[PDB]
């Protein structure tokens, strides 16, 4: 996953000492359509469907077109 | 009353049995199929040793084998499949001569039409799907269809109105007119969802039946309900008798049949203990099959057999 979440940059800058590095990393967000981040999840975040609008009562009937 | 006793037993297996299939033409053949991929054809026998034989095995299909259904001729039968395709096996080479492609998932149950000219399906993908002998796609259903897996689909036997039925995990039946291509009726009570759906030789009635243990009686052309027989724990597989006018049910462990005049259990069909250290000690039934003399029944199990039963006095 650290090749598609991570995004990273290394740097030198000339001060009148000498050489400082600077290094900057970053972790993007998902995003499932829209070009922020990448589309793909990470591979141990699953999901669950939350369930809906069932009746629990019944009583037999029938229901002609 | 009738009484039922067990025959013998038939070994010839590698995974639990899915379905039976019989007909009038040839009363020393039996087919089923089966999860280890494969359908058996018996040679069926009156010897003393043994009831039957394997004779031959059809091989071609990649997953599970989930229906089987043969031709009125006794010449053909065709077979559907957890690798989503439908096949037409000839039964004198032991070879397919047409395959049936057009499912993205998963198929559940298949039948030919009264004539044999028209082949029907339903399966996980939640279409209903209509074919040619030919191997070419007619009519899909699609938005009227069930919200949820579509468990089963039947022809009516008569000619005279011709119809189709159909059960789902939607807990619904529906009923479906054929040239017209269209849903007729609706019918609700069921609490679980269903695993089957039947029709009477005479073109009668429908029963129903799954997870909640209850078998429902409703009208093909009437469009009403009729009365509700508990059976148990839970229905996997209804059938009528060819000429008596009995209900029968596989249910768990045990095998029921119902007199309908009056209303009453006329016996059920256990098995000798094997002690097991868990819940669930016997093997489950999983499907049913009269012959075509209806004097002698044929029971599928999750233990690789298939038992058979005569009625007695």
Same mark, same amino acid.
């Given at each position: 996953?650290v090749?598609?979440?991570? +995004?990273?940059?290394?740097?030198?800058?000339?001060?009148?000492?000498?050489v400082?590095?600077?290094?900057?990393?970053?972790?993007?967000?998902? +995003?499932?359509?829209?070009?922020?981040?990448?589309?793909?999840?990470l591979? +141990?975040?699953?999901?669950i469907?939350?369930?809906? +609008?069932?009746?629990?009562?019944?009583?037999?009937?029938?229901?002609?077109? | &009353?009738?009484?039922?006793?067990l025959?013998?037993?038939?070994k010839?297996?590698?995974?639990?049995?899915?379905?039976?299939?019989?007909?009038?033409?040839?009363? #020393?053949?039996?087919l089923?199929?089966?999860?280890?991929?494969?359908?058996?054809?018996?040679?069926?026998t009156? #010897?003393? &040793?043994?009831?039957?034989?394997?004779?031959?095995?059809?091989?071609?299909?990649?997953?599970?084998?989930?229906?089987?259904?043969?031709? /009125?001729?006794?010449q053909?039968?065709?077979?559907?499949?957890?690798?989503?395709?439908?096949?037409?096996?000839?039964?004198?080479?032991?070879?397919?001569?047409?395959?049936?492609?057009?499912?993205?998932?998963?198929?559940?149950?298949?039948?030919?039409?009264?004539?044999?000219?028209?082949?029907?399906?339903?399966?996980?993908?939640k279409?209903?799907?209509?074919?040619?002998?030919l191997?070419?796609?007619?009519?899909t259903?699609? #938005?009227?269809s069930?919200?949820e897996?579509?468990?089963?689909?039947?022809?009516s036997?008569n /000619?005279?109105?011709?119809?189709?039925?159909?059960?789902?995990?939607?807990?619904?039946?529906?009923?479906?007119?054929?040239?017209? $291509?269209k849903?007729?009726t609706?019918?609700?009570?069921?609490?679980?969802?269903?695993?089957?759906?039947?029709?009477?030789?005479?073109?009668?009635?429908?029963? /129903?039946?799954?997870?909640?243990?209850?078998?429902?009686l409703? #009208?093909?052309?009437?469009?009403?309900?009729?009365?509700?027989?508990?059976?148990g724990?839970?229905?996997?597989a209804?059938?009528?008798?060819?000429?008596?006018?009995?209900? $029968?049910?596989? &249910?768990?462990?045990?095998?029921?049949?119902?007199?309908?005049?009056?209303?009453?259990i006329?016996?059920?069909?256990?098995?000798?203990?094997?002690?097991?250290s868990?819940?669930?000690?016997?093997?489950? $039934?999983?499907?049913?099959?009269?012959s075509?003399?209806?004097?002698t029944?044929?029971?599928?199990?999750?233990?690789?057999?298939?038992?058979?039963?005569?009625? &007695?006095i």
């Open positions: 996953p090749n598609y979440y991570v +995004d990273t940059a290394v740097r030198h800058v000339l001060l009148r000492q000498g400082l590095g600077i290094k900057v990393k970053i972790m993007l967000p998902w +995003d499932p359509s829209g070009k922020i981040g990448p589309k793909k999840p591979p +141990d975040h699953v999901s469907v939350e369930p809906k +609008d069932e009746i629990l009562p019944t009583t037999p009937i029938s229901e002609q077109k | &009353t009738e009484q039922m006793t025959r013998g037993t038939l010839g297996h590698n995974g639990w049995v899915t379905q039976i299939a019989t007909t009038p033409q040839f009363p #020393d053949m039996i089923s199929a089966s999860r280890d991929k494969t359908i058996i054809m018996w040679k069926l009156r #010897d003393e &040793t043994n009831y039957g034989i394997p004779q031959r095995a059809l091989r071609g299909h990649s997953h599970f084998v989930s229906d089987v259904v043969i031709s /009125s001729d006794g053909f039968a065709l077979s559907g499949s957890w690798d989503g395709t439908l096949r037409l096996w000839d039964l004198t080479t032991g070879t397919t001569t047409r395959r049936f492609v057009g499912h993205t998932k998963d198929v559940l149950s298949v039948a030919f039409s009264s004539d044999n000219r028209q082949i029907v399906s339903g399966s996980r993908d279409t209903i799907k209509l074919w040619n002998t191997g070419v796609c007619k009519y259903v699609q #938005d009227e069930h919200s897996w579509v468990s089963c689909v039947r022809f036997p /000619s005279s109105n011709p119809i189709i039925v159909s059960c789902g995990w939607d807990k619904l039946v529906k009923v479906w007119n054929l040239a017209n $291509c849903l007729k609706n019918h609700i009570g069921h609490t679980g969802y269903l695993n089957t759906v039947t029709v009477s030789p005479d073109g009668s009635l429908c029963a /129903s039946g799954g997870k909640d243990g209850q078998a429902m409703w #009208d093909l052309n009437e469009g009403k309900h009729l009365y509700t027989l508990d059976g724990d839970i229905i996997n209804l059938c009528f008798s060819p000429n008596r006018y009995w209900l $029968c049910a596989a &249910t768990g462990p045990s095998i029921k049949i119902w007199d309908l005049e009056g209303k009453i006329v016996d059920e069909l256990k098995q000798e203990v094997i002690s097991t868990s819940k669930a000690e016997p093997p489950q $039934c999983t499907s049913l099959a009269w075509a003399d209806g004097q029944l044929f029971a599928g199990y999750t233990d690789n057999l298939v038992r058979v039963w005569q009625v &007695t």
